[PDB]
């Protein structure tokens, strides 16, 4: 499960999700009925080569999904997202 | 704990570590005696503002450290590292 921090400033709700190996265009950020913010996507996996040998396998892959019900002060039509170095930031202005 | 995959191809040992939020310059990649590869660093935390309210705190911070003993076929002096999308790739040629 995706680790997400959620902070509320006087100006905005700010979400930060750790999504290593993804960039912005691969993460779907959307608003659903009832003030719900949804983040989702799929982390892709490199194709294996016959000549590869593994010594450690610890990283996860596959689908991720988180949903947050924002409070009434949030301007859900003004959601903006950006990503850098594996961290997604979603800002919902108040 | 940092998740690290280690693959060995005919050409190299390839390590991939999920280190979201870190710049390449913040990650120390070092070779120590006895063919040990060490990866370490510290993820910084944004200065707290008294006016903020936290709704969710899930993301890790603080120091990390992993060590790997490479086999004799690794050319430890030719190590290279790069980071992209919160993934550190360390390549040790064979």
Swiss-Prot record, chains A, B:
GO molecular function, one term: identical protein binding
Cell location: Cytoplasm
sHSP domain: residues covered: 1-94
GO cellular component terms listed in the entry, alphabetical order: cytoplasm; protein-containing complex
Keywords assigned by UniProt, alphabetized: Cytoplasm, Stress response
Keyword Calcium in annotation: no
GO terms (BP aspect): protein stabilization
Keyword Oxidoreductase attached: no
Assembly and interaction partners: Forms oligomeric structures.
Family: Belongs to the small heat shock protein (HSP20) family.
Protein name (record): 18.1 kDa class I heat shock protein
Lineage, top ranks: Eukaryota, Viridiplantae, Streptophyta, Embryophyta, Tracheophyta
Gene assigned in the entry: HSP18.1
Full protein: residues contained: 50 to 143 of 158
């Amino acid at each position: 499960s995706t680790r997400v921090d959620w902070k509320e400033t006087p100006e905005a709700h700010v979400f930060k999700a750790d999504l290593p190996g993804l960039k912005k265009e691969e993460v779907k950020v959307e608003v659903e009925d009832d003030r719900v913010l949804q983040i989702s996507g799929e982390r892709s996996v490199e194709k294996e080569d016959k000549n590869d040998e593994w010594h450690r396998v610890e990283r996860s892959s596959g689908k991720f999904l988180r949903r947050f019900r924002l409070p009434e002060n949030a301007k859900m039509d003004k959601v903006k997202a950006s990503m850098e170095n594996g961290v997604l930031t979603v800002t919902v202005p108040k």
